[PDB]
Amino acid sequence: SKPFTLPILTIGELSNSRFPAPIDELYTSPNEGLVVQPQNGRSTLDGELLGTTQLVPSNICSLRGRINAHLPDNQHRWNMQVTNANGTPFDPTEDVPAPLGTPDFLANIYGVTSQRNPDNTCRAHDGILATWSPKFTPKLGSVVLGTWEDRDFDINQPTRFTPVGLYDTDHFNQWALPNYSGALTLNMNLAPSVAPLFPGEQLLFFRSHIPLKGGTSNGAIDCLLPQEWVQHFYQESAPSSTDVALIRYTNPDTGRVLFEAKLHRQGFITVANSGSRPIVVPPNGYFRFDSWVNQFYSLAPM
Amino acid sequence: GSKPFTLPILTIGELSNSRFPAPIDELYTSPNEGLVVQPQNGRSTLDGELLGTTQLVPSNICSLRGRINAHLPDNQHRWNMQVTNANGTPFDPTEDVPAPLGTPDFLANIYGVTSQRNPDNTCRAHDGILATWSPKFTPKLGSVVLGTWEDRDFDINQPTRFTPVGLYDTDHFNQWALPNYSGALTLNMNLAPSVAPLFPGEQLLFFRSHIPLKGGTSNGAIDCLLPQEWVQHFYQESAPSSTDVALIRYTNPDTGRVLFEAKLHRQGFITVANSGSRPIVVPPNGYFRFDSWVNQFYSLAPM
């Protein structure tokens, strides 16, 4: 078989796969009572992308298309038809939950909506992508973008939303999926929920504290795999010999090993740990693949 | 045996700009008559030695982070920021880089958002400008100025980050003009070298993005020598280069149909046999594949 590998990347060299941001720390938590089912940053270990996951980092939580209308309310809102990169409208019959890169959490996402016309005249206005809105219907090919009172966009010109962070904390829940087709509809083609199946284990996350325009929050976005691991597995396509890869967080200069973890075939990590805490790792260290083990493998407790 | 050199399996719609956070929109070639082409982001040798200000994390391209340390005494709503490493230690100007890694490598009014989060999780963010042409843009000395608008304030000595979005306007915009990383009347140091064709009848080939512009008229073109994914691939692979020039061919893997060929130079840039300034259209499913080690005297099939 083509041997399985992880990329040689320290924590300061990793990116979040659910929001455009550097990884700030590793984190573990029980997430009691919640369903953990992110749709970005989802890949099998042998490189099959899942959910809404795609490879281009600047397309994470970005959508593009053409603005088609200014809405007749007092909220300064603009409807956008979502397109592919070639300008063709999104096809709702594609077996994805939503256009690739669509945000996978409820929030008021602060960002900038920009346009460039064929004659190279441009405009951009900061504002909000409300992923909880009844008119957030990206699987139907349309979303609404907000800005402020005095701002206009051009109808039917190429349009892009660049995400920046959270506008505020209203509606923010990183583990609540949007209704990709709007109210009273079921999401489809989802990457499965993930949970520890072995006793004494918790998920391990790659955490970013993303920007927040106003309010009080740690802004935590937890991904199952950093974007670089998604990219690596996609390129490598190494066969998964068992359901679980044993990985160890290692300092390459001294060989000192900090802890060990289970990297599951479906693309997430578990550790033997209790409670919600940040993990501190050596700045020069990174996970190394050790061996393929079985699901009942007992990890050394952190 | 030596590890074979390879390019990643990535179509043009799967590539990223290495000089600005943006997808690649097209390939582009140009003689760039009379200009010195010397970008500092998106620079790597084929064997994976990063050069200039190049670093691996895509969301850190044209970002700076640190701690705001002063509100400046004019009507311009400008804030001085001490640049830091991720752990909060100040940037060390004696590091043999031109500037902190990921620092912008072109003159512009860059539109973005400056955000803060205090230890007690209280936050604030305000849009505004990073003016890389300003006398106060001195990232190699560990400080830059950030603008916002009236009656917007930041906390002194709290963690701060600038997220770039695009161009604020076109004033001072020149993608091939390097900043003065240490300010007025200083020389830039530790630069990745300028690049140009070495063989007659060739031009550079660029991976081009049209980045956002807040107001004005411009195609917003940012041309990189290597997409960010190729920088990332070479860094991981570290395959030794057998000669100074790799012959690469833009190929559709479904049919084997080859569109054109190019030279991928050891120092990390591409040339093609072409004349004139024009975008290039490629098959959506195609990508460059490494064909063979040639050398600089290899005569390319004309595009």
Numbering used by the authors:
A (entry chain A): 224 to 525
B (entry chain B): 223 to 525
The authors write:
The norovirus genome contains three open reading frames (ORF1 to 3), where ORF1 encodes the nonstructural proteins, ORF2 encodes the capsid protein (VP1), and ORF3 encodes a minor structural protein (VP2). There is considerable antigenic drift among human noroviruses, and new genetic variants evolve every other year, which can result in new epidemics worldwide.
The equivalent residues in the HV P domain were Cys345, Arg346, Asp375, and Gly438; in noro485, they were Cys345, Arg346, Asp375, and Gly438; and in SMV, they were Asn352, Arg353, Asp382, and Gly445. Additionally, in the noro485 P domain structure, the polypeptide backbone of the loop hosting Asp375 (termed loop A) superimposed poorly onto the corresponding GII.
